[PDB]
Amino acid sequence: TAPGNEPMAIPSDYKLVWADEFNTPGAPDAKKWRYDTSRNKEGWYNNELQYYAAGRPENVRVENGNLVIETRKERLTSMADYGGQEYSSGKLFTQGLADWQYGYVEVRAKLACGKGMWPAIWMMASDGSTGWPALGSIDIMEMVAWDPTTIHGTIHTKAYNHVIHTQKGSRTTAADPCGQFHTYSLDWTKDRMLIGVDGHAYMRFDNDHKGNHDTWPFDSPQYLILNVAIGGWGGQQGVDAAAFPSKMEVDYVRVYQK
Ligand SMILES: OC[C@H]1O[C@@H](O[C@H]2[C@H](O)[C@@H](O)[C@H](O[C@@H]3[C@@H](O)[C@@H](O)O[C@H](CO)[C@H]3O)O[C@@H]2CO)[C@H](O)[C@@H](O)[C@@H]1O
Ligand SMILES: [Ca+2]
């Protein structure tokens, strides 16, 4: 629904304005990432099966220059916010720490595989007053590991979203995404978004320039989100116990702006 076919690359006139190179082993940098626990006890959206553990190295850690988000089959019943889940995982976002209006986002990542796994690199608007989906969401990368070579790039707005099946997205494939790094990229300007892998946009979404927040909510800042969900879209061919633990490794997040 949002086909692209054009190169993409860090614009020559942009500077690197924000980066997490995951240089510092241990916990993620608290000045860059917060943990999202907001629906642990209730159950996450999308019929998701994971508990997202905050402050827990087994799920979220920096090692050897990479962020590691790791899913595990386990019941974290000692957690006050435990929601009865069979799995643990990690969700980090830059909410309240850093956000961007326009820019080139480049994330170099090795994905988490195993039927059930749903790694994602995405964004939501800092101003959520209009609620989901109207606020505007940018999926720079989703993969569901029943189809682990397929890379999905999607935007959601009030007009264009998955609840009403009008989401603007595309897909491509990439070599062994769980075994080798690729670059997952967004080029967002006032005119359009390109979403790509390894310097190729497979997804394009234009600003129609109608000043309709329903079709272009993207003239306000967005923060970045990294997670690995379990089940929902990831669970289309079940959740494979033998797949755990599974990890997404992120070498870096770099954000460029004019
Ligand atoms: O169902 C209404 C509730 O929606 C909440 O928002 C969720 C939404 O339900 C869920 O579908 C969505 O899922 C994300 C995808 O749209 C896509 O953007 O990729 C993400 C990464 O895979 C995936 O999580 O997430 C929305 C935000 O959590 C509202 O938060 C809630 O107020 C509302 O009642
Ligand atoms: Ca690194």
Residue numbers in the entry: 8 to 265
Which sentences from the paper describe this structure?
Although we did not manage to obtain the apo form of the mutated enzyme, the structures of SCLamE144S cocrystallized with five different substrates, BGB, BGC, C3, C6, and L6, were solved. It is surprising that, in all structures of enzyme-ligand complexes, except for SCLamE144S/L6, clear electron densities confirm the presence of a 1,3-β-D-cellobiosyl-glucose (G3), where the β-1,3 linkage is located at the reducing end, from subsite −3 to −1. In contrast, SCLamE144S/BGB and SCLamE144S/BGC do not have a clear electron density at positive subsites. Coincidentally, ITC curves from BGB and BGC were fitted to a single-site binding model. The SCLamE144S showed a 100-fold higher affinity to BGB than to BGC. This result is in contrast to the activity assays where the enzyme displays stronger preference for BGC over BGB. In summary, BGB may have high affinity to bind into negative subsites, thus preventing cleavage, whereas the BGC structure leads to optimal binding for hydrolysis. The presence of the same ligand (G3) in most structures, even when the enzyme was cocrystallized with cello-oligosaccharides, indicates a high affinity of G3 for this site. It is also noteworthy that all SCLamE144S structures have an α-anomeric glycan in subsite −1.
SCLam, a GH16 member derived from a soil metagenome, an endo-β-1,3(4)-glucanase (EC 3.2.1.6), can cleave both β-1,3 and β-1,4 glycosidic bonds in glucans, such as laminarin, barley β-glucan, and cello-oligosaccharides. The enzyme SCLam has the typical β-jellyroll fold of GH16 family. The substrate-binding site is located on the concave face and is composed of the catalytic residues E144 and E149 (defined as nucleophile and acid/base, respectively) as well as other residues responsible for the substrate anchoring. All structures have a calcium-binding site with a Ca2+, heptacoordinated by a hydroxyl group from the E28, G72, and D258 main chain; D258 side chain; and three waters.
